[model samples]
Target: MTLGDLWKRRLNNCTKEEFFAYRRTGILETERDKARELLRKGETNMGLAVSRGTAKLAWLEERGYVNLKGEVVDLGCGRGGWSYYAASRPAVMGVKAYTIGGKGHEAPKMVTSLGWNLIKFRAGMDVFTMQPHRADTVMCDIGESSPDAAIEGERTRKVILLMEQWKNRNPSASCVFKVLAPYRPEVIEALHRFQLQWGGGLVRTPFSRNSTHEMYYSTAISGNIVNSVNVQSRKLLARFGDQRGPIRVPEMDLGVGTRH
Candidate 1:
């Protein structure tokens, strides 16, 4: 097995120090015992990142554009799902994972421990800022700050389209930005700005688990050719129905709050 994969199994199985010792040939019997217990009870948490990312991966793969190989940049890559999948697949070059706050669970460190180049960023360019490393695929499914991401009429509705500029996923590459559906005309018009040809849709994602008012504001990218796509995931959370006004991203012409 690949060292990366081996590390994953042990990481989920052992403790930091125990794993550290093993890596250094300094492992103690007691440490190994503790690590074993943690793994069994999940006393050591893998965090939400894995789930969030797998959810996205499962959703992305459903469409069939991104396969085993492709450079992937996962926005707000918590739980290391995107990074995890990318690492597991040899074809998936490298991954540049982004997230806010600090690594409470040593999230970045955990990812890199498996031999990934997981860069930790806080409010600075290290984490919160910096453009994507230009991958064949850029996918993001971040949580909205309440009603803004609550599938509403706010400009945040259109933020899905502006993801193009961040084309940072690889300005020369393609991307998949998620949004809450039941869109306004303005949102549709904004996508046209990218001159996207449009693909298809991704349905039945976690956000769609319930009767909630949610949909994956989906779109795709392929080389210099980017196409807008749409998919409906089951709505799990109640939409409260977008009490906030349009929260959009701020593109050049798009102007102020074009993407929330």
Candidate 2:
């Protein structure tokens, strides 16, 4: 069906109350207050990002990247939060949530329900090699596909490589990544290089409530804006830059090891 047809279907099938009701169930829980507020406006579909939505949007906005008037590629889009949020913006040209597949999560259905474009391409490398309008806004909510199975998607190390490729292809793009403990120092180092005015924030994950005590994070490395940062993240940002801070790379942060 055409996009218009899909949008018509979505409008008929979706509802603000039904959408927010879903959030309370922990389906896409742990979201930021701003993200929820953005969804309420109903400019786009219902989607989310890691460590919640508000943090990432705020991360960019605080640095003057708000209301981006370009394509936004939400890699590893979990439940379409950031996708939905970015899609809703007046300046955003479009939002594409690319993933290997969306078999288990409610993402695909929600993408349809909201009528936003959902692209499925597994080879992470291809995002750099092929595609129209390489997203100026690339966001990632990557994590272990399953506990002990290594970071989610094809190869954990491939994601690290993908980051480099993305930067090479879209160096000027606004890159936001949701990180977690079992920290990957290489990943952080790469982001630090990309945006000299970089910083990160610890976000509690659903798994944190579980036995594993998993705590995720979100970091932004902007090609624009440096120095000025979110007040809440000031201390965290300072720590990363501090020579005396204990910033050792956590054990197994790289997951199963780099993929070729």
- Segments in model 1 whose C-alpha atoms lie over 4 Å from true places: 1-49, 62-68, 102-129, 148-158, 168-172, 192-207, 211-214, 217-260
**Candidate 1 lDDT for residue 60:** 60
22-66, model 2: which lDDT tens digit per residue?
Answer: 223322223246544544564233344323443445445555543
| Candidate 2: regions farther than 4 A off | 1-67, 102-107, 111-133, 145-157, 195-260
**Candidate number of the best TM-score:** 1
Residue 202: error of model 2 in Å? 8.4
**Quality of model 1 by C-alpha lDDT:** 0.41
List clashing residue pairs in candidate 2: 47-80, 47-81, 48-80, 48-81, 48-82, 49-82, 145-152, 179-217, 182-253
Residues 195-246 of candidate 1 have per-residue lDDT tens digits of 3544424333432322222334444423221122222211111121322222
Cα-based lDDT for every prediction: 0.41, 0.41
Query: Residue 123 error for model 2, in Å?
Result: 12
